[PDB]
Structure 1
């Protein structure tokens, strides 16, 4: 019993973190096989960041300008290329700690673990969601760029995020491992406002199921609703609209608890309309939206 915001074990990714230095800019890189992945803005001074031409800036760079350090040992760079907003540094040694891994571009609502690093040394791990405005609510200080987000399925690390930018509102923007930004963000020190931070409705319902499963049941009510009725309420409270796909995805938690998804929607509706009246659910005073149905099932059935 008990329900916790839980990150994947970070070992397999700790073994991939290196320091990348170009001139006097230092940040984190990801060493997988004989390639080191890092944000392309490693080649910028903060002067450069107001309006950089990365193609022009890169022309002044050579293999030997990219200093890569795995712990204390220096890696030899035999090639560099720009892919979208990341650099790929070909090194002459395959990382012997390379896990099985994939690159995946996640959708908003999907959750992942972040290994926050400074100078290629891991400082801590925490759980995130890709927000519906394609920001993440991270914890990232100066030098944390190149820190990566990941899921682990048994032996396989799926890398979904590389950290690039803190927006002036202290939320975070970054790329998949192909260097394509999530959302409309650019690696440029400009005006970039986040859109509406909408709540991930399907994740809140998953978390309500997690609560039922763990004893917290006070918010179960006598009522039901329809997808269309629930959605009117969702709109009013800047909740993502709930689809039949969301209902389907919640089926296993439905089945296990014996609460129809549309009954749980009616419970959520009442919570949106009445607030929690000073009570808590799984030790929280608001509605948590960064547990996926998959996260709840995993944590509620002890998957490794």
Structure 2
């Protein structure tokens, strides 16, 4: 039993982290087969961080301006291209530690693990979620750009996030591994602000189902609700609307515990109205929204 926020084992990703340097700037890259992926702003200088013209900047670069270091080895860049906001450096050597992998674009509410790196060396691993406003509440210091987020299923690593920047609110923004940003953000240092963040409702309900599994029932009630009445209420607490897709995703947990999905919604509505009265659920005094319905079955059932 017990319920921890759990991250994926990071070994398969550790063997892919490299250091990429252009002029004065050094950040992390991802070495897979004979390609190193990194954020394109590694070619940006102090002078033009507001309105960098990446096409004009990249055409002026030679292969040997890119310094790639895998551990103690220096890799030879033999070609370069840009795909949206991700730089792709072709190297002469394929990474022998390349795992089975794919690139996936995730949706808000989905969870993944982050391997925070500095100078191509791993610092630590943690679990997090894509917030509804397309940011992540990460732990990133200067030089962490290029760290990646991933899931692991069987033996296949699905890369879903690359870190690019921190916003004034302290939260973080990045791209998928095809270089498309999550959310309405751009790799420019002009004024940008995250949209108002909300709670991932389907994840909260999943975590309340996990509590019942693990034996906790003090928050249940005899009421049910209509989907619409629930959303009217939850929106007033800055909760994400619940869709019929979400209701279907929770179908399995509703079976294993015998509590109908709209029944559990009534309990959540009551918790928002009352708080926890000094009590806790699964060791937390706040409602947790970074466990997906999938994670809950992974770790419980």
**TM-score normalised to structure 2 length:** 0.98
Q: Deviations over 1:252-285 (max 9, x none)?
A: 1111111111111011000011111221111111
Distance (Å, rounded) in 2 between the aligned partners of 1:156 and 1:173: 25
Q: In the TM superposition, what is the alpha-carbon distance from 1:59 to its structure 2 partner?
A: 2.1
- Give matches, 1:55-134, under 5 Å: 55-134=55-134
Distance (Å, rounded) in 1 between the aligned partners of 2:196 and 2:278: 26
Q: Structure 1: 5+ residue runs without aligned partners?
A: none
Name the SS of the counterpart of 2:196 in structure 1: coil
Q: Deviations over 1:194-240 (max 9, x none)?
A: 11111111000001011111122211112111111111111111111
Distance (Å, rounded) in 2 between the aligned partners of 1:134 and 1:88: 24
Q: In the TM superposition, what is the alpha-carbon distance from 1:46 to its structure 2 partner?
A: 3.4
Distance (Å, rounded) in 1 between the aligned partners of 2:54 and 2:248: 44
Q: Deviations over 1:16-45 (max 9, x none)?
A: 100000111000000010000000011112
Distance (Å, rounded) in 2 between the aligned partners of 1:25 and 1:47: 13
Distance (Å, rounded) in 2 between the aligned partners of 1:96 and 1:215: 46
Paired position in structure 2 for 1:158: 158
Distance (Å, rounded) in 2 between the aligned partners of 1:274 and 1:5: 25
Name the SS of the counterpart of 2:49 in structure 1: helix
Q: Does 52-61 or 194-203 show the bigger shift?
A: 52-61
- Which portions of structure 1, spanning 4 or more consecutive aligned residues, are displaced by more than 4 angstroms? none
Distance (Å, rounded) in 2 between the aligned partners of 1:300 and 1:224: 25
Q: Does 170-179 or 218-227 show the bigger shift?
A: 218-227
Q: In the TM superposition, what is the alpha-carbon distance from 1:287 to its structure 2 partner?
A: 0.8
Q: Does 10-19 or 57-66 show the bigger shift?
A: 57-66
Paired position in structure 2 for 1:39: 39
Q: Does 265-274 or 277-286 show the bigger shift?
A: 277-286
- Measured on the aligned residues, the alpha-carbon RMSD in Å equals 0.9
Distance (Å, rounded) in 1 between the aligned partners of 2:292 and 2:125: 18
Distance (Å, rounded) in 1 between the aligned partners of 2:63 and 2:252: 51
Name the SS of the counterpart of 1:58 in structure 2: helix
Q: In the TM superposition, what is the alpha-carbon distance from 1:60 to its structure 2 partner?
A: 2.1
Q: In the TM superposition, what is the alpha-carbon distance from 1:49 to its structure 2 partner?
A: 1.3
Distance (Å, rounded) in 1 between the aligned partners of 2:14 and 2:260: 41
| Pairs aligned (count) | 301
Q: In the TM superposition, what is the alpha-carbon distance from 1:48 to its structure 2 partner?
A: 2.6
Distance (Å, rounded) in 1 between the aligned partners of 2:198 and 2:66: 40
Q: Deviations over 1:150-180 (max 9, x none)?
A: 1111111110100001001110000000011
Q: Structure 2: 5+ residue runs without aligned partners?
A: none
Q: In the TM superposition, what is the alpha-carbon distance from 1:142 to its structure 2 partner?
A: 0.2
In structure 2, the CA distance between the partners of 1:298 and 1:46, relative to structure 1 (3 Å rule), is: farther
Q: In the TM superposition, what is the alpha-carbon distance from 1:125 to its structure 2 partner?
A: 0.6
Q: Deviations over 1:40-65 (max 9, x none)?
A: 01111233312211111112211111
Q: In the TM superposition, what is the alpha-carbon distance from 1:243 to its structure 2 partner?
A: 1.2
Distance (Å, rounded) in 1 between the aligned partners of 2:77 and 2:209: 50
**TM-score normalised to structure 1 length:** 0.97
Paired position in structure 2 for 1:193: 193
